[PDB]
Amino acid sequence: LVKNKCVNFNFNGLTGTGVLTESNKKFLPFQQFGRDIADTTDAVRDPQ
C-alpha cells in the first residue's frame, strides 16, 4: 500500500485515480466505504 502520490487506486475491487493522504471520518465502526455530496468515494478503509 502506497500513499501521498497519484496511483490508479484499486481498493476492495473498486478503483479510480487520485492522491490519497490520510483520514479522519472515523466510519461508524461497522462502516466501510466513504462518500461525499456527489459521493465520489471520499474515503476508503485500506483493508489490507
Binding site: 461525499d36 455530496i37 456527489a38 465520489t40
Partner: peptide, 28 residues
C-alpha cells in the same frame, strides 16, 4: 461586504471552475 456573504473545491473536483475576476475588489 460583511453583510452579503455565502464544498467549493469539492465541486471543483468534477470539472467545475470559478475563474477569478479581472477587477479585484481593492481596484473597484
Amino acid at each position: 461586504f460583511n453583510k452579503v456573504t455565502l464544498l467549493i473545491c469539492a465541486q471543483k473536483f468534477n470539472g467545475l471552475t470559478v475563474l477569478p475576476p479581472l477587477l479585484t475588489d481593492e481596484m473597484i
